[PDB]
Design a protein around this ligand. Sequence first.
Ligand SMILES: [Mg+2]
Ligand SMILES: [Zn+2]
Ligand SMILES: [Zn+2]
Ligand SMILES: [Zn+2]
Lengths: 141, 263, 133, 196, 114, 559, 85, 168, 49, 43, 159, 65
Amino acid sequence: EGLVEYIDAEEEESILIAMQPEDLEPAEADVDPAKRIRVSHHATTFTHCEIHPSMILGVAASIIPFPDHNQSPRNTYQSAMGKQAMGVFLTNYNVRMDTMANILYYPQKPLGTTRAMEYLKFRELPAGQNAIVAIACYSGY
Amino acid sequence: EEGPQVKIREASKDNVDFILSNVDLAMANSLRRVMIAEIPTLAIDSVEVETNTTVLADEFIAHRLGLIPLQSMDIEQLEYSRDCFCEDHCDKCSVVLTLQAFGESESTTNVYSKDLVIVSNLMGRNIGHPIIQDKEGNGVLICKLRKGQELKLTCVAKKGIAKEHAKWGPAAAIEFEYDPWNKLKHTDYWYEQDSAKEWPQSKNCEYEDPPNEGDPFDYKAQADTFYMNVESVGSIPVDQVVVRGIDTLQKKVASILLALTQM
Amino acid sequence: SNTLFDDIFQVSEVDPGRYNKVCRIEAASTTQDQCKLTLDINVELFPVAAQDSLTVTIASSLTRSWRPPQAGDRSLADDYDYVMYGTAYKFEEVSKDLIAVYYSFGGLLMRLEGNYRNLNNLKQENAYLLIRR
Amino acid sequence: ASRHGQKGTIGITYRREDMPFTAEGIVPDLIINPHAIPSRMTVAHLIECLLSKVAALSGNEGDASPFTDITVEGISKLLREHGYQSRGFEVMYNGHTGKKLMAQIFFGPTYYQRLRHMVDDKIHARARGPMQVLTRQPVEGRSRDGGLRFGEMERDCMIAHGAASFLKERLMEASDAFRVHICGICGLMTVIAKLN
Amino acid sequence: MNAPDRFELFLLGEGESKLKIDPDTKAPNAVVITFEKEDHTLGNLIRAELLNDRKVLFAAYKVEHPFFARFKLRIQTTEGYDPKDALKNACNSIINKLGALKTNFETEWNLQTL
Amino acid sequence: RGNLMGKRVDFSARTVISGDPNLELDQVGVPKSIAKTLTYPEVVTPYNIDRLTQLVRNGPNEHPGAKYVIRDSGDRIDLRYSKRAGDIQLQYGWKVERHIMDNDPVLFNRQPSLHKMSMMAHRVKVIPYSTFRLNLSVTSPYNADFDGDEMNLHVPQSEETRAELSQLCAVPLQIVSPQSNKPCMGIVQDTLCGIRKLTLRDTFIELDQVLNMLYWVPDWDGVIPTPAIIKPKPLWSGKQILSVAIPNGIHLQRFDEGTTLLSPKDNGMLIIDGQIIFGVVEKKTVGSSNGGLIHVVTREKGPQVCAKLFGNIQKVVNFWLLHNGFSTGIGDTIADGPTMREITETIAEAKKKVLDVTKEAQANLLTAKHGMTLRESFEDNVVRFLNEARDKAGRLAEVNLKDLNNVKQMVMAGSKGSFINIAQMSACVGQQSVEGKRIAFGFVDRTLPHFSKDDYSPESKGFVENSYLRGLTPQEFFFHAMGGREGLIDTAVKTAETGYIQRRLVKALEDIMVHYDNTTRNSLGNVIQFIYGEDGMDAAHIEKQSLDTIGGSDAAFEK
Amino acid sequence: EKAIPKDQRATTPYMTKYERARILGTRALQISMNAPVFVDLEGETDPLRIAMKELAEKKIPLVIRRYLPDGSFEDWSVEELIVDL
Amino acid sequence: ANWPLPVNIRRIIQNAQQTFHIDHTKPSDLTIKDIVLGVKDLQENLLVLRGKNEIIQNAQRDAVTLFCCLLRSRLATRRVLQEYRLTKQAFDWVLSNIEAQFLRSVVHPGEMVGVLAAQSIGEPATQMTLNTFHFAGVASKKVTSGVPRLKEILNVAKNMKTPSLTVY
Amino acid sequence: FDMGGYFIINGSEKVLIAQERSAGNIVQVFKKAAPSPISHVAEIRSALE
Amino acid sequence: TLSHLRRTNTPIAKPRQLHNTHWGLVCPAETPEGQACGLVKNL
Amino acid sequence: YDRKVPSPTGEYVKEPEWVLETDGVNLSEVMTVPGIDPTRIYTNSFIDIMEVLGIEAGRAALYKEVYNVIASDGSYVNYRHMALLVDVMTTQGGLTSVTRHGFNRSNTGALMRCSFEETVEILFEAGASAELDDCRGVSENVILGQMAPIGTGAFDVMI
Amino acid sequence: MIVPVRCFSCGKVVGDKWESYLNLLQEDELDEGTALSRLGLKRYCCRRMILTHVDLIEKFLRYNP
DNA sequence: CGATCCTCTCGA
RNA sequence: AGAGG
Ligand SMILES: [Mg+2]
Ligand SMILES: [Zn+2]
Ligand SMILES: [Zn+2]
Ligand SMILES: [Zn+2]
């Protein structure tokens, strides 16, 4: 229908993209202080618009809660981490004959999820547990 | 009526909201500790697996079985197998349960705690019956079966305290709070603007009198009034949780006394 | 020994300074024209308001394990309100005949300026600061 | 590991009684160190916690998605209505003594991962065992019951300490050691060793 | 694998005694009682009750390592009072305090309805 | 390199390590398994005979046991399969390979073994559980933490080999490092955090807490120190019961800033006879500092005496803190309502100064100083304004964080954290750089295709206005990710490079040693230094001392 | 040849940590290999702890041969070396 | 002023002050001849080398030159009495303690210095951060810093990356 | 839940790792250092399908 | 599994560094540390 | 550049001065220039200092730069250590690098050198020239599994 | 993979609550929060056990074996 | 020549 | 050689 299109890096060179669809094309004439400070759209000669900013990441980072509130390398480390974790890798484990396989007894879906996780399944085949954690210095152990 | 005073606010089949007045902190805490892991009960300690054709592993099921709450009313009328003179277990030291279930219908067959049946001599003791609190009367869902599926196992339930394994607790969360005004200054409150506005008042504020800002801090004062709520898991009734709680502590203290006599 | 000092002081200013239980007090003598006093007080226990006049003293008795109070023959040089134990750590000769004393009550410091502290203080781990009404 | 690039092994296991408790009776399943926070600057960890506490209570999923309008103030707003103090803190009592902690604890749910690599799968020790075919030195790998390497880097450390007689033993009596018959003329290992 | 048996926390070992009394070398009239297969449940309770007795000079407890089920109690008394008997007396009072609690909670329970 | 300079060895072990606050400095927690696996060849003497015969009796499966009994003629007796393993009446001269037991000397190591302090002798303490247990104050020389790190343990087999460990390589002997003439180990983390806390002037303790605290010190005299307070409620200061861990004859003096012997800020340090007089104890005192408690206690009272210190310091602090707690909440990053406005105003004026400097450059009224490009002058100035802003907004945060601020508290103790961390989390993350220049035009004439061409603005070239608490935008995110990646690359490049560099030195200086005339020479016997270090002095025994004749006026010198 | 005169020697009269460690070791080895003990081992039983006692009492009959780069040596008896460290 | 030297003198003076319980109100029992000749006889005993010949004795004099400046500066006649207020008993002990500590502070023949020095440079280098020049507060201060610079040096690079000349 | 995209080679599941390469037929210019006798170069990575 | 199936290898001027153009095509975060950091990337 | 220098009174005071910073080296030609201090002129190129002012001046420069890389990263190391390295490079007459071309080419042992780089080539060069090892090197004894003349074995035990 | 018996944290019998929960959301049309409150799971430690549960058994049951 | 070590499965 | 601490 021509409402959406595929752009490669070469063609990207010639276009002007908007990050948010609404927050990037309104009008001009108080604000939430807790919210992040976003720059005004300024240039208004758009050819395209981002489907959703979050789509710059992939499988790995799309599992991280609030990566936009983390120091750059921490997000890269968590990217290696999830791969070294364990849980229900597939429903058919009972049926497969794999050299080494670890499955969680009682896997839990995160209490805090990414909209991306839906497509990633995750909530369906988890890798962790919603542990009640205390940040405190107890026995020094 | 002399010494430590008790005042029950609320009482139910599995909950006791009381006020332990005129007691040292150590006392209220040690009793809280003993109620968590030292009051004995009955729970599955062995599982013999004849047939398992289910999606769940033998030990996964065995694990779940151990957690299953069992009537532990007359537990002092049962021995620890370690004390029993018998080869392995018996009727004086253990309750044997059977569990045979098969996928009858094409429709998914659920294996409940009600499906566990005693195959040992109880000797008129209120012991080994699986605790069912479920309104439909099924209790804990142990496993799920398809059609060709079947589970046939035998399990020996033994006596124990939670200190050995969490499954052995009449447990559940135990509410504990002393001084709902910090009149003792036992905790320095964290804030941004004002502690009173950002910290919420606990229901126990109703009973105690507020500090009254125009008064200096009570130096020599000590904690004696304790607000507590003991929750029963079902193995033992609530009254008995606290009573056997008091008892176990009392018992293990008297053992230290007759230990001095021996040496 | 017996009391080695006795003077009624007048509070000039009260300062918490990042603390909530401790307060550094600035006091001046009611009798002497030069005798100054600067000391830390556990205000949570004994509140020291502005424009207060307090009787300060440094005794020596009322070495071995500290025995708890106990309701016995126990009678201390305490008829007072606020009592501390300290240690001498420095003695400053603030020119001419003016002397300065330095006592630490386990962190709660003390500074007393005067002249007549001759047969009063020595470099001893002994100090007993009694303060009343 | 938490979902914010910070691994860790279990230090110790404490049973419920010893564990610090809340005025409700809630207890941690895990205790993390306050020091493993500022150096790394993982605020999302603290936030992912705050959101999960509010989530479990309300009975709703936590929108932890990145480029959103979800604020700490917003999450806090609800949690404060949901009874608890808005910043994740809770008054806790020491399980040993039963006395309140002077410091309030940042408590609440946080999704953690069970990581592959477990103590027992790594524990290894070898007081003499199978030798290599060629080099006559200990074999490689724990499954083969091999030896830990005493590299050049470790030989340096010993040569720094001055421990010469240890360094010899660690390279002779432990590992390979051979007695060869040397020619008093050649200086070679071409001597017919006809012992006994 | 290297983990001990969970009963080793309440079950006394082969040739193990619940109370081991040793004379304190650092000071006169003091004792170092070692409690085997006991924790803070008992430690704190006894020590807090010892402090209630006026004739007690010093009373403190320490569990040197969490892995182990031991606990060390140290008692110093006034001249003419055996600290072994100080344990006895304090330790006795605890039973009485609990005895009162039991019969008082029981009175309240029957008075309540549900 | 593989089979001669280095090699796999016997009587070695490896496992995941974990810290233990109830372990001594020179101790190592060896799991039973490993302790059962490793042996020592002990010859049968009349002094040992009784214990050894009892050890043989226990056998390979019971811990204080043994496997293998070597007879005269060197024929071994495998105890797990010997028919007469129950028999065996030991004879003098026979060797008994006994299990590794408590208080045995063992070489503990962590790779990369970059300096001698990475490889130290320890006292064995056989424990249950699967991990290699160790004192936290040994974390630094070895360079470990407990996020999964494993360590190597080797066991000496000769009587003379075990001497070399205890007499030269022992943990207390290695406290004062020759490398930096300062101690290499100090009080860390919780202890470093909790010492500061307990030792505050405001901090006071009751009868009950004091006694348990005193009894926790092992080498305690047994005498209750007199309470600092003897009025309604006999109270004690933290400063007091901590001074119990400090030994006799210990004298320490500091003076930091507002330090006036009457110290209003409770800063600096005064320790006399081994009792604390004033000041708060922290990193400068109880850390691995040049003039701190440790360099003093080691040199003054002894290495064995000093090693014992950490333990006592840890036992009192840890206990106190265990019964006090301390967290880190998200609230600790939530800086003031009006304080945020000032931080936001800072970025506002920072952004304006750039706009102006840009407008000025675009107008050709910018005349760059000698040596640097008109354009490179612009960049330098812009970067400078933004860095100033980030620092200022960050200083605005710090100067608002309450004393009850958990983050600030660690930074104050020096346990963890720094200013930048506060700044970035609560105020403003700041500018991102790659190749030292700001975010470059990867796309023709732009950084991102969501911006117009020729956009030299802060936000276009990678300035993160937002804090970590507020969160980064999609642009800010990618830019930070670009900068973050650089770090990650030149960490891997540095660990590769520094590693090789090390080996190269270590090979060139290998054979260099002090001879029996203080001559620093090689294996050929060629003089490098006629006197070592130019004085013929050992590097550890040295310490910075002010030379009072070099400075001051000629008038002051005479007086 | 080679040697050095007894009252003509510049090497430290003090025993190095290395000379101590090696001496303690060599003796402990002898003690453990059922060799005579030249001091009353009042209480003691560890061969190294015994070697340490023998040293403090100065009853160790061993001589340190200190080598000089040129190929010369100074002979210092354990019974004469200062042990300050 | 502050420079790494064996024997912390401040501590010894503080030790004697505590050990002998020095009172700042009583006059000392020391002669000017005692202090002057004492500190003088002390430095003659602060040995590093022992050789009877000229060269070694000059080398010995040379080795201790700087330490003696501290000794002399700290143990001057005025200081000993005016500041320290030391008695003879206390002062004599100080001299023995200084010598004791100095002889203790010396290096041990057999000490493997090469390996030490190498690891002493190596280990710190292995901790270095930010390849982008630290001394560069401005672009006109962008000189090679960190590991790239350290590599340049160790390799004795004929083709120096940022060659600069600082002219006075 | 299985996505495919892999191969089963002797019962073992193999993923073909996508390989990055510089695209051909592209015209590019590169400035040559300083010891070089030639100042600039124009290159083409010519190849057929 | 999914993250393995979306891996990209670059063999052997400066690559490694998250280039501007990588926006929306390669993940900024998901990359290994050391060995081949940045050469191994993920879509 | 701020310079701490003694005042007429004697006490040290900061006297800020003007210093010229270059982008290139021709030291020999810049020191022979009017209106400068030729006694003070520095270069980050210690190799030129060596060529213009001699080996001994090169040593002082080599260190000044080594110290500077360590110091720049906030770190402190004791003088003796880098003093040794600096001296090691210097003690040959010229600037001997810590590369396979610098120290590993010097007239030491043969088993001593092969342990670093060029392993086989070193052993082959020992083939042609009939090399002799004193075995007073660490590596040689380490290779031969002998108690090397290190701390413990740096002397002998008699009776 | 089947509703854990008893809450990991506190131990409240949760192995029975599941079927009732799934019907409270279906037939009763209730929201998870009120449904968790209806079953007596007051503390969040309990709440996460039921809320956060993924009952994978229903998928494994689907295989014929 | 290009840090150390550690587990490891897999052709040929 | 590759996969990963
Ligand atoms: Mg690590
Ligand atoms: Zn039985
Ligand atoms: Zn021959
Ligand atoms: Zn719960």
